[PDB]
């Protein structure tokens, strides 16, 4: 052990490195506490011809254009074209990279804290968050993609609304006409920067709706407003197919109608899961009706038939809206519990 | 589709043996609207590989034993585009040429030994000139009945 | 007595020099860290431009904030680089140059009117080598006006010379209001047929039937070769079944056989969505081997709903 003797000397060395770092590392905290102000950064390559070639382009939000390299310490989402830089006085260097988005605006889009069907939607959503230890063994590929469609009159928006409350994640809403604005080129933008929230973000839950208006083809030659949707979609299934971060937090969409469909919406990383409405049934509607009505005081005396027989076409709103009705007039009534008349009486009302 | 020639595929196999090559003249105009239908591109490839076996094991049979040669190359001759006159739209498949070719030239080299000295130089000045008709080739084939005459 | 001595010596300094990779290792680092301390030592330079020169020594700069200066010339930089038409860096102090500022089968067809899966190999050679990454959208028009933008995107493929264009779904904009696009189209023959080398750049096109097409722009001269893809190789199949039987385990019993030849008009990312869907049918009976009967009879199923969902 006497060759082993000279580590005890090395171990010193260590630890007197890490003894006179303590200032080195002390000046950091004080010296990058408060960036002054905030600058664009672009990335763009040179070429020195070690001496390696590196730059970077700046731009000032007082519009004055600077030079400067690369540096700063370790980077791994940096080198970005992104903003929100930390820099000091007249060094206008690189420290802290925060990625806040541009033109933040569309990203806040809101805040948000049939058994058979819906125990395979539920088992569906539910997995991806669950079963990814288990995804090793099985080797399961869970789908991206989900197309939730069928006829009008289903109610299927607040019934994926009701199951991103089961989801208990964060969720977002984004229509169809919100892709749709007056200026050129929005597509892209919008992709890339939802996808870097996505990125940034917690596995949140992600719903589009009417997909099928926006991605019309247009059969008919003679002219059309949107054709910008379609590209849209075209770029989203790109960047669905030919990038590996496609793993990440999954995008639902869903259609209205079946007019329109594109039979390049068939992947893993697209479109999956189709499943087609056949005349929802009136007792499940009695079921979830009751769960959502469970926490109101009401009379517990009910057939449940004359409610289920006198609702036809009818969406999930639209019972919820039944119940409200019925909540309306009861406090007119001048009784304090609800009844079971009042729910048919309001169905007779608002339909 | 394929299914209905491949029953008179492999049961032309059977049926013809000892016949002349009169009955292959009969087979022309059989073969001939049989190369017009079949519009599928994948569904007939199957046809395509067989029906021209059939007729290269007819023409096998009659250069088996004894061969005049003369009428054998005048077919071709006169007879390449001629079937695909009738169609307008392009066939674009790219595929069983090369097999069909290969085979030919296949056989061709079964016979490129000894077999009789006239009809030869018929068949290599005729091939050579189809190397410029054709324009479109693997360039393999097209280089080894060169490179195989340039031997001789 | 004297033996075991030297193998718990052996331990002792075994464990005495397995603790030096926690920390030999992230000294690297906190050197690192220090080094681009000393990195960050060089600030305070700015940008400018050349237009006119008149002394080939010193010459006249302009400022992207648009006030005009002049500089002199370092003695390490050349009079090589110094040559106008090129964007130059300067120093605030005594208005120095540390460098300069630098600005940012000639065809194939490719139908696909039996199914799809065209984009996955695609996404191979993308994947593989594809010399670039680049990617052209089907329509740049929508974004008369895009025509400058076309222009523009063909003068970065003629700024970068290796180049591979990748089209997909080309039929949308194969098909006043048809004379506008009759008029980008002669743009994109007037394009095309102009004067450029496409002995380098590459272009790929994506699409659904031949109908839309334009068989007059699918000519020998507008596109070299067309190649029809039906379906994966059956050695390509069987390739992508195995690396997909890779991570699920599955009975002593397997034959990979049945599950290719059994399969007709299928695309591989669609049939790796149905081994998914076979799996999760499979996962009902919470057993943690799967034999290839249930996988088979699945498969067939869902792939014959695909067959009907075809339309």
Not at chain 1, 246 to 269: F, M
Not at chain 3, 21 to 44: I, R, W
Request: hydrophobic content about 40%; proline content about 4%.
């Amino acid at each position: 052990k006497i060759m082993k003797s000279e580590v005890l000397r090395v171990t010193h060395e260590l630890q007197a490195m890490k003894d006179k770092i303590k200032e080195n590392s002390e000046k950091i905290k004080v010296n990058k506490t408060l960036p002054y102000l905030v600058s664009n950064v672009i990335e763009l390559l040179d070429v020195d011809p070690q001496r390696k070639g590196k730059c970077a382009v700046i731009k000032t939000s007082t519009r004055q254009t600077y030079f400067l390299p690369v540096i700063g310490l370790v980077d791994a989402e940096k080198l970005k074209p992104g903003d929100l830089v930390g820099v000091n006085k007249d060094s206008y260097l690189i420290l802290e990279t925060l990625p806040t988005e541009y033109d933040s605006r569309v990203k806040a889009m809101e805040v948000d804290e049939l058994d058979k069907q819906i125990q395979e939607l539920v088992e569906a959503i539910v997995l991806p968050m669950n079963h990814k230890e288990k995804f090793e063994n099985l080797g399961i590929q869970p789908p991206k993609g989900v197309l939730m469609y069928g006829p009008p009159g289903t109610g299927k928006t607040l019934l994926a609304r009701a199951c991103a409350a089961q989801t208990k994640a964060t969720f977002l809403k984004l229509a169809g006409p919100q892709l749709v604005q007056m200026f050129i080129g929005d597509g892209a933008k919008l992709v890339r920067d939802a996808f870097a929230l996505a990125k940034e973000k917690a596995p949140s839950i992600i719903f589009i709706d009417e997909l099928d208006a926006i991605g019309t083809k247009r059969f008919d030659s003679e002219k059309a407003g949107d054709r910008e949707v379609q590209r849209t979609m075209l770029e989203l299934l790109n960047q669905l197919d030919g990038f590996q971060p496609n793993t990440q937090v999954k995008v639902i969409a869903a259609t209205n109608r079946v007019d329109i469909l594109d039979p390049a919406l068939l992947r893993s990383g697209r479109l999956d899961r189709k499943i087609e409405f056949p005349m929802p049934n009136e007792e499940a509607r009695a079921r979830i009706m009751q769960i959502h009505s469970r926490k109101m005081n009401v009379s517990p005396d009910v057939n449940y038939e004359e409610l289920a027989r006198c609702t036809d076409d009818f969406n999930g709103a639209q019972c919820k809206a039944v119940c409200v009705e019925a909540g309306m007039i009861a406090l007119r009534r001048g009784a304090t519990e609800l009844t079971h008349e009042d729910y048919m009486e309001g169905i007779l009302e608002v339909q | 589709m394929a299914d209905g020639g491949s029953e008179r595929a492999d049961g032309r196999i059977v049926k013809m043996e000892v016949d002349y090559s009169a009955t292959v003249d009969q087979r022309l105009p059989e073969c001939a609207k049989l190369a017009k239908e079949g519009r599928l591109q994948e569904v007939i490839e199957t046809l395509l590989s067989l029906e021209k076996q059939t007729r290269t094991a007819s023409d096998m049979v009659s250069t088996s034993r004894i061969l005049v040669a003369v009428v054998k190359m005048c077919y071709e001759a006169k007879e390449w585009d001629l079937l695909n006159e009738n169609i307008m739209l392009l066939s674009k498949r790219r595929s069983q040429l090369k097999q069909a070719v290969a085979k030919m030239v296949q056989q061709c080299c079964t016979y490129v030994e000894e077999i009789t000295d006239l009809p030869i130089k018929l068949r290599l000045i005729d091939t050579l000139r189809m190397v410029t008709e054709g324009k479109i080739y693997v360039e393999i084939e097209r280089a080894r009945l060169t490179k195989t005459l340039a031997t001789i | 007595d004297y033996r075991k001595k030297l193998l718990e010596h052996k331990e002792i300094d075994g464990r005495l020099k397995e603790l030096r990779e926690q920390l030999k290792e992230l000294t690297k680092q906190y050197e690192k860290s220090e080094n681009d301390l000393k990195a960050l030592q060089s600030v305070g330079q700015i940008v400018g431009e050349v237009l006119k020169q008149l002394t080939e020594e010193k010459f006249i700069v302009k400022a992207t904030n648009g006030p005009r200066y002049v500089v002199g010339c370092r003695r390490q930089l050349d009079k090589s680089k110094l040559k106008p038409g090129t964007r130059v860096a300067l120093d605030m102090t005594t208005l120095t140059i540390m460098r300069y500022l630098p600005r940012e089968p000639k065809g194939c067809l490719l139908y696909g009117p039996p199914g799809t899966g065209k984009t996955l190999l695609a996404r191979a050679v993308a994947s593989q080598l594809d010399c670039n990454f680049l990617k052209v959208v089907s329509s740049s028009i929508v974004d008369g006006e895009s025509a400058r933008l076309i222009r523009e995107m063909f003068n970065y493929a003629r700024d970068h010379q290796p180049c591979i264009i990748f089209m997909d779904e080309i039929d949308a904009i194969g098909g006043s209001a048809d004379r506008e696009i009759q008029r980008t189209l002669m743009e994109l023959l007037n394009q095309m047929d102009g004067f450029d080398t496409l002995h380098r750049v590459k272009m790929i096109m994506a699409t659904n039937r031949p109908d839309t097409l334009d068989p007059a722009l699918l000519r020998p001269g507008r596109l070299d070769r067309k190649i029809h893809i039906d379906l994966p190789n059956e050695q390509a199949r069987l390739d992508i079944l195995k690396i997909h039987a890779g991570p699920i385990t599955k009975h002593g019993e397997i034959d990979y056989e049945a599950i290719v030849k059994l399969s007709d008009g299928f695309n591989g990312a669609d049939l790796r969505n149905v081994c998914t869907e076979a799996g999760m049918f499979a996962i009902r009976a919470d057993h943690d081997f799967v034999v290839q009967e249930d996988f088979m009879k699945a498969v067939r199923k869902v792939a014959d709903s695909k067959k009907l969902e075809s339309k």
